[PDB]
Amino acid sequence: EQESVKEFLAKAKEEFLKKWESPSQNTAQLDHFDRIKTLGTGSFGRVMLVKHKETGNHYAMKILDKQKVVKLKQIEHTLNEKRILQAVNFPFLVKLEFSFKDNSNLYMVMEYVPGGEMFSHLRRIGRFSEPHARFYAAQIVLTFEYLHSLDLIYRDLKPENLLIDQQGYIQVTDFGFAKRVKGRTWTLCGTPEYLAPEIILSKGYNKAVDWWALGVLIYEMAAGYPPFFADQPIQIYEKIVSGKVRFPSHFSSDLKDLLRNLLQVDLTKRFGNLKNGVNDIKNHKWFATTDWIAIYQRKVEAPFIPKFKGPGDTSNFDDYEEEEIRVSINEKCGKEFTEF
Ligand SMILES: NS(=O)(=O)c1ccc(Cl)s1
Numbered sequence: 001e002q003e004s005v006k007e008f009l010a011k012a013k014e015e016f017l018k019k020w021e022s023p024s025q026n027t028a029q030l031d032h033f034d035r036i037k038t039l040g041t042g043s044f045g046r047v048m049l050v051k052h053k054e055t056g057n058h059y060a061m062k063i064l065d066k067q068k069v070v071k072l073k074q075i076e077h078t079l080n081e082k083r084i085l086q087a088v089n090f091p092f093l094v095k096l097e098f099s100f101k102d103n104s105n106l107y108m109v110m111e112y113v114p115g116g117e118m119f120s121h122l123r124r125i126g127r128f129s130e131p132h133a134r135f136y137a138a139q140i141v142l143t144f145e146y147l148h149s150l151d152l153i154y155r156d157l158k159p160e161n162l163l164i165d166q167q168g169y170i171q172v173t174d175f176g177f178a179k180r181v182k183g184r185t186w187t188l189c190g191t192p193e194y195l196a197p198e199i200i201l202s203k204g205y206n207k208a209v210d211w212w213a214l215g216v217l218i219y220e221m222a223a224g225y226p227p228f229f230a231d232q233p234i235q236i237y238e239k240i241v242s243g244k245v246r247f248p249s250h251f252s253s254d255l256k257d258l259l260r261n262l263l264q265v266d267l268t269k270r271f272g273n274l275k276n277g278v279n280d281i282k283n284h285k286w287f288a289t290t291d292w293i294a295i296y297q298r299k300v301e302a303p304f305i306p307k308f309k310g311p312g313d314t315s316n317f318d319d320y321e322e323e324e325i326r327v328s329i330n331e332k333c334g335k336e337f338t339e340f
């Protein structure tokens with residue numbers, strides 16, 4: 001690769017490792033913020049729009065219930081998420097601004113991206129044109145080049161985790177399954193439609209699973225639906241492992257060729273995992289019109305700009321029951337979360 005890229009990634013890794021080895025901790029507290037609205041909710045946490053009471057800045061605050069994290073066996077994953085997020089720095093990764101914990105919860109306070117999830121925009125419009133999908137895909141390629149060079153696997157690529165910012169660029173959110181891995185790792189995690197065969201088959205897997213997931217994402221962006229769709233997970237899994245995929249006739253030949261190489265069931269033959277690494281993807285004909293440096297520098301005009309009224313607008317997110325954020329009078333699970 002150009003010495004320019006090598007030197008960029010060497011500096012990126014140096015800066016990551018310094019923060020990785022000495023993580024920040026306890027940089028705000030709950031009563032510094034006002035609660036505005038619930039933006040999303042899951043089995044062990046939720047994401048809230050909050051406003052800092054002194055600066056007036058808006059943030060997305062992810063709140064995890066320590067007791068539910070323990071019960072759902074997510075301890076290590078939550079520690080991964082925060083340690084990684086506080087150490088990374090890249091244009092297409094959502095920035096962690098503060099983190100802290102209390103008797104009941106863990107808190108990660110991130111930049112708020114008011115444009116909403118790619119998922120919503122994709123479902124609204126149906127499918128993205130190839131140029132539109134390519135613009136987003138290029139950002140993911142560069143982001144994975146960055147993450148993988150730091151020995152990080154992302155493991156949760158899907159449209160819901162890609163927010164569209166005020167310039168129409170992607171910000172990857174939700175590092176709940178991200179992990180620093182030299183070699184292989186084994187945990188069953190992700191989301192069914194996006195899982196690589198080697199995850200389904202319980203193998204020791206590596207960063208090639210992220211490149212598989214990129215194939216799924218590109219297909220879904222360009223078609224409007226993912227390639228292995230079914231009513232129940234086990235039926236999805238049978239399609240994934242089969243080695244068969246069908247493409248809409250509207251897909252270009254170049255798109256089909258790239259997707260066959262990303263959706264390669266043999267991980268040793270999958271683009272992104274060969275001797276030329278990411279360059280097999282960056283040099284593919286489907287990306288011939290992409291100026292990789294201009295994308296990184298955010299100099300390309302985006303396909304669209306989400307409609308929103310300002311940094312506190314929640315119109316691109318959906319409505320959830322507003323539940324209490326309670327803090328116990330007694331510390332819970334202190335030992336498990338000492339390093340957070
Ligand atoms: N006021 S409270 O319910 O303790 C709460 C404070 C800040 C939040 Cl964000 S939620």
Ligand SMILES: NS(=O)(=O)c1ccc(Cl)s1
Nearest residue numbers: 131132135289290300303
């Ligand atoms: N050429 S590119 O940066 O991938 C791109 C820009 C605008 C698109 Cl639509 S596709």
